[PDB]
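Monogalactosyldiacylglycerol synthase 1, chloroplastic
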Amino acid sequence: DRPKKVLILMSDTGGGHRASAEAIRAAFNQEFGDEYQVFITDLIAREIAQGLMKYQPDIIISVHPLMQHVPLRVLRSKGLLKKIVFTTVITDLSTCHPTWFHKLVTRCYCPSTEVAKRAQKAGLETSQIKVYGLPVRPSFVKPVRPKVELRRELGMDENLPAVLLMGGGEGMGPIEATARALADALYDKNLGEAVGQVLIICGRNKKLQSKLSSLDWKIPVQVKGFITKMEECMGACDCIITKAGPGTIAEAMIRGLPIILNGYIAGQEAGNVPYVVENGCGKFSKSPKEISKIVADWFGPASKELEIMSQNALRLAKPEAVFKIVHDMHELVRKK
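Predicted structure tokens:
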């Protein structure tokens, strides 16, 4: 028809998830092309009012818990509410805050049926609620090379089972202690045999990255900084240790990785934990000793438990969330 503009509201503080926003932007790009131009704005009323005028969006998307009430008010203050489709993509996997929901919204996209039940609780009608899962980048969703080919490209051992350890960011138990604990649990002293291997992704924690990659490891340990392609990394491993950041969780499930939740950002990600644990996809622990035992058992005596949890994750996985959402927004905008 005519080119349309999309504004996605994030805020670097207060919860919510920008990787979902970027995932959404990439999905519009892939699916539709220049039929849509997509901006992500980090911001309250005056700024909203500003960004409204800067981008004059056809459709507004909120990936933030605080981005419903004020933006909607301002939309009604400027008579824009019937012109502009307003949508919410909840980035809390479970157990959310009431603010995620707003009756004046057009559509609210849920990552679980649990969250959707909460939307119904809030008075939103069936037309306003969809459950497609939590959006993940498309480039993540491409079926990936074989395990040994990924392992080799990442400098890992080809045969040992691997735990993905994420050390980036805030909220986790001791990463260095955890890696050392992992090395001890996965070494057979008499055999001189590594029982497993570790891949540590440091993200932006560079002090951790240098310390960990200067150590002498009992088992194969690969240390990295920032990784653009998480799909290759997750495809090379057999389980994952991480903070209950929602994207990382939704990614791991797509790759059938059983999760050890290493913690969470308080006030933000703690509702993600039951989504993992109560659904049979993983465990919680911050302790290095407790974590490494879990991995060591999953790589030996509880290996049946690992395979079962690995099936539970694929079953919960929704790799097509991103496409579904944007195709739904596409038709939402069109009915005008």
